[PDB]
Unconditional design. Structure first.
Length: 289
């Protein structure tokens, strides 16, 4: 039950060059975007920070309040840290600790020319992300939007789960189905709210880590990355056919171990998926010696 810092809107406007929406690569401040806001690089009290400016108005305000509420309760090595918020001015802002290496989605795509992540780094990221989800499930929270754009990477490439605006603290049904289609479990697409859906979404993240492919590509066959599990099961392809070629240190044994965890997470029947504790254990055994 943390109490956060309150920033002035105009200070956040000032330190992000008036919310300069141009990419940082061309002299602007924009680091990224979500369906509910834009992320800007800023500089407050000599510290580099990230400012998310939120863009119905009622639903957006509830997600702003939910992010603050969930962050006040959940604090862990593998969850991004909220520093403060702003609500006095024009737009709602959320301020976080700066993640120099951006999102796992952007690092897997090598966006802006960044070097590809090694298999060694990918194993640490998968372990860290599972540890963060474990902390959330232990604290009775369902994330509801696990995806590589919501796994940030700090100065040491430590995984930091982000975006708690849709998180639910507690199988139960909702009339407002939310999440990212390409990562959603079948029961989540139907309105069910359960931590088993976070496990399924984490399985799609593990396939992105192994393959370097985005969860959805309308110009690819199959369009949805989760469909490769069936191609591999029906022996039409092997996990070796899909391994990211942008690595030089992957070994078949540990890649097959990560794939086995992903396959288990992606069981269509929610009760047949492992829980997050089992996923953590399997990912630890993957690198043990
Ligand atoms: C806003 C919390 O922190 C961040 C977000 C970032 C980002 O976000 C994409 C989507 C939308 C919002 C979300 O959580 N994921 N892409 C790239 C770099 C980011 C850096 C940071 C950072 N430096 O803290």
């Amino acid at each position: 039950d943390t109490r956060f810092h309150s920033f002035s809107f105009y200070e956040l406007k000032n330190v992000t060059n008036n919310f300069d929406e141009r990419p940082i690569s061309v002299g602007g401040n924009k680091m990224g975007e979500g369906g509910f806001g834009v992320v800007y690089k800023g500089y407050v009290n000599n510290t580099t920070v990230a400012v998310k400016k939120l863009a119905t108005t009622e639903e957006l305000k509830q997600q702003f309040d939910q992010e603050i509420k969930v962050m006040a309760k959940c604090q862990h090595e593998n969850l991004v840290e909220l520093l403060g918020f702003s609500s006095d001015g024009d737009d709602l802002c959320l301020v976080y600790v700066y993640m120099p290496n951006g999102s796992l989605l952007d690092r897997l795509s090598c966006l802006d020319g960044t070097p590809p992540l090694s298999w060694h780094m990918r194993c640490k990221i998968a372990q860290g992300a599972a540890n963060g989800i474990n902390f959330l499930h232990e604290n009775h929270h369902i994330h509801r939007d696990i995806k590589s754009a919501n796994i940030l990477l700090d100065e040491a490439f430590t995984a930091k789960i982000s975006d708690f605006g849709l998180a639910r603290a507690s199988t139960v049904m909702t009339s407002r189905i939310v999440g990212t289609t390409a990562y959603m479990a079948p029961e989540a697409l139907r309105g069910e709210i359960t931590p088993k859906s976070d496990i399924y979404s984490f399985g799609v993240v593990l396939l992105e880590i192994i393959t370097g492919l985005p969860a959805v590509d309308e110009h690819r066959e199959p369009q949805l990355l989760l469909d490769i599990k069936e191609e591999i099961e029906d022996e039409e392809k092997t996990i070796e056919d899909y391994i990211d070629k942008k690595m030089n240190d992957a070994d078949s044994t540990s890649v097959e171990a990560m794939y086995s965890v992903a396959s288990q997470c992606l069981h269509e029947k929610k009760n047949k998926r492992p829980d997050i504790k089992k996923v953590q254990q399997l990912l630890q055994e993957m690198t043990a010696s």
